[PDB]
Amino acid sequence: YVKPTLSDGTCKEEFTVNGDPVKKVICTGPHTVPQCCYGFCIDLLIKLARTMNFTYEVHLVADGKFGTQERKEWNGMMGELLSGQADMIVAPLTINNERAQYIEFSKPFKYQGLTILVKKEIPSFMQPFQSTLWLLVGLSVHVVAVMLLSSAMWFSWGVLLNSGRSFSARILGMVWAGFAMIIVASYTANLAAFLVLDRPEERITGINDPRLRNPSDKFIYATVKQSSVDIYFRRQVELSTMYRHMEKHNYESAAEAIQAVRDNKLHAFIWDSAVLEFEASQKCDLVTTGELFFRSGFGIGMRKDSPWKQNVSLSILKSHENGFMEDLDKTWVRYQ
């Protein structure tokens, strides 16, 4: 999280339920003005800080991009490790072959994948109660009203809904008394049968759906520009038409791509599983469909031949078994 700091330069103190004091570090980024950051992985940074007793200063990314190959050169966060403006990357950054040939990754924080987020627009009382269905109701009562003294005139209406002799007519009424039951019995199951029509909410079941492989102008697909999902779709020749024309709808950041979905302006959003699932919990009006298809994790990137290669990948590996990475999970991700 990134929030502006107070007037005095130290941002406001928060106390989640019991919680203990919330841990906040002063981020200095975009000109440039200081801020303060709350963090899931920042609570992980402060843990690594005390173990190897190294001090730190945190500054935001210059351009807000994750990183990819330009033209011959890297951009975003990767453009600041190689150059020398940073010695570590504490942010959700997936592991893949292209990045692994230039930096070192350690072991993942958490294991996840990536999915697709779409609208969850999920909305008659008696739809068939019209046309001949309603017309036949009036005809039956009117015909029997003068079938044959006025006591039986209201009898037909009352006998239709529970309740309130002329020999042949008495038997005729008796046999017709059960006739009202069968006709209304179908009505009871008519709406019951009409209650299971449902709607096609299975808009996109993974990549292998025919809509993705054959994109139509009705559907608009998007991701975040210069990220790992962009790389994943430029590795496969059979998907050369996937983003041949759907590349121009790529969004700048995942913060505003989700807002586009809720504005009925975007139809599909492909991004990390650990992020979209959390958003679906808060919003309570979106949904994630499909299945995970590229399983990797978030690791601490650090420049090649760095002398902290073994230290970091052991504390992360130990923290899973202590339960520390589960205490963070409940306080930050899976609560509601």
Partner: protein
């Protein structure tokens, strides 16, 4: 080591000396020259690895202990083979752990694991 879904060993169909084609020869190195051949999820990865980068392998099964343990300061099992320079590579069902990874270098994990509990359906 033999794990039923991941590494499967078979008597190699002792007709003359050979078994089915989707298998690789194995051994039961101990210190009866029976020959057996193995297949599974892990071995399929091993065959693909040996093709992209050129090398040859000599699979043998561990007859001392199991996946790995340290009793009285001595490692026994798959980790004890790599630790004592008895093999250049251990494959199968090994879980990345704090104590092993400080003695033996691991690689990128294949699949997720951990600890879970099962119960009879009622």
């Amino acid at each position: 080591l033999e794990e039923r879904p991941f590494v499967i060993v078979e008597p190699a169909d002792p007709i003359s000396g050979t078994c089915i084609r989707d298998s690789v020869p194995c051994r039961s190195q101990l210190n009866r020259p029976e020959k057996r051949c193995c297949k599974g999820f892990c071995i399929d990865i091993l065959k693909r690895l040996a093709h992209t980068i050129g090398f040859s392998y000599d699979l043998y099964l561990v007859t001392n202990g199991k996946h790995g343990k340290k009793i009285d300061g001595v490692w026994n099992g798959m980790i004890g083979e790599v630790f004592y320079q008895r093999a250049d590579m251990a494959i199968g069902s090994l879980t990345i752990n704090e104590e092993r990874s400080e003695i033996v270098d691991f690689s990128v994990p294949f699949v997720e694991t951990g600890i879970s509990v099962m119960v009879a359906r009622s």
